[PDB]
């Protein structure tokens, strides 16, 4: 069982053109309710979204908290900013998803044999800092920029046990699936 | 919706005091901090004061040297700004604002405050008369800004233009116009409603066809 | 503690993409949130962007804020710039105190040209009983703002007692007014009074006459 399933739902990443992106859910948001179902863990949101879709619910309420950073002078005593939203329940039978991802850092958990990843020499346990000069925090950010790199060389910066190495790669199409891939496994 | 409406502005002689008010509605007042931000055409938006949600902590800008005192009454959902020792450089439009942790989420309508020794002058309002007819009202010789003009107590809202005033010899003069079909001018009456809050003056003038 | 520096004015064309900058003098841009406010002419500021990039409900998705800790400058971006986007824009931040930017007056060009319409008004009889006369010339529905207003008495140019207001923007186009102050006898002493507006080569004019009723 994955570890994030018990942690609170703090949005680490939102996919574009998804239900969550179009509705305005941003990274750092914390989902606390949907219809109903109280949401304290990622497991709750997953099970609630499955039952809602199977029950035929197409629209429902989604309560969300948006906080962080240093308080503004005079506004330190303000109550938490809660957001009442009307979400479009993703059709779980058709494979739809809400479009939000947890906060897991891009630490590699495995490298495929012969795949263009040992090509340059990236090892498991490596922490992917940034990609192409783009500061990232989650693994889904790096997968975003493999398929829109359109075969061009991508530059990545990796921290290994203390030292920060720089490694580039260029792999693209594949005959089996038909998409771009690099050859890295999340932990 | 969140509503913040200011009150208690106008004209003051240099050195005397004014207390601005800001009535809030449409949200839990005591759950959020309030603030006051003034605006001059020369400086722009300048923060003045801020008070915490409970009313225990207060924060003041640089231009206030212990003169202004911001308070709030969570029972009436209203916060206030006492302004003592006013100078001519304090003449500005004063907005109250609601906070949401890290920013001002909603602003008021702003109230004009004029610090001058020149007394207030109520405007003289004159009717303006010459298919679609264009009527008007001349708001002549008032001080200070602003004035508001409505037509038929607000019932005539489309085709209403309130032109900015001209300044001449320390007095303002503007014109407000409304374009109405003559079918409405002949059947029912047309009236402009001028208000000059600084002098607590309200004036109505019916637009009747010309004479000789 | 620190100030925020904005370009005082930025001119862009309709349909393009404007980037309004907000440079923080000292300190890190990311240690405090940056918020953007839009203030139309004579209206109250509303929130366009809060918490660096969060857009409130109602604000069109053409607006988007960003943080650049490299240059310590915040950027408000407006794609497919519309006519209603022409306003003032103030960036905002805080620390020990609360700081506002200087404001950027976003002027947007390319909107279609329009010729001024004119409405003149004779002096009211109630003002004439005070032995004073004020001729009103209303100028509406015209773009751009640059205009020239002049008066004439029986066709002869008169340049004494003329007060003209600066052109202001109301909705989609511009607005202006002009006044000619005369005495009740000066008003009756002439056969014709003409308000003349010259806007981009064109010359529009309407006239007033005191000899209406016999």
Numbering used by the authors:
A (entry chain A): 116 to 181, 181A, 181B, 181C, 181D, 181E, 181F, 181G, ...
B (entry chain H): 20 to 149, 157 to 238
C (entry chain L): 20 to 233
Paper text:
Our target protein was an integral membrane protein from the hyperthermophile Aquifex aeolicus. This membrane protein is an orthologue of the Escherichia coli intramembrane protease RseP that belongs to the site-2 protease family (Hizukuri et al., 2017; hereafter, E. coli RseP and the A. aeolicus orthologue are referred to as EcRseP and AaRseP, respectively). The high-affinity NZ-1 monoclonal antibody was established by immunizing rats with a tetradecapeptide (EGGVAMPGAEDDVV) from the platelet-aggregation-stimulating domain of human podoplanin. Crystallographic analysis demonstrated that the inserted PA14 tag adopts a loop-like conformation with closed ends in the antigen-binding pocket of the NZ-1 Fab.
Hence, we deleted two protruding turn residues (Asn182 and Gly183) and inserted the PA14 tag between Arg181 and Glu184 [this mutant is referred to as PDZ tandem (181-PA14-184)]. The complex of PDZ tandem (181-PA14-184) with the NZ-1 Fab was also stable and produced crystals under several conditions. X-ray diffraction data were collected to 2.5 Å resolution, and we assigned a PDZ tandem and an NZ-1 Fab in the asymmetric unit by molecular replacement. As we anticipated, the folding of PDZ-N was not disrupted by the PA14 insertion and complex formation with the NZ-1 Fab. All residues of the inserted PA14 tag were accommodated in the antigen-binding pocket of the NZ-1 Fab, where the 14 residues assumed a loop with closed ends, in other words a closed ring-like structure. The 80 Cα atoms of PDZ-N, including Arg181 and Glu184, superposed onto those of the wild type with an r.m.s.d. of 0.750 Å.
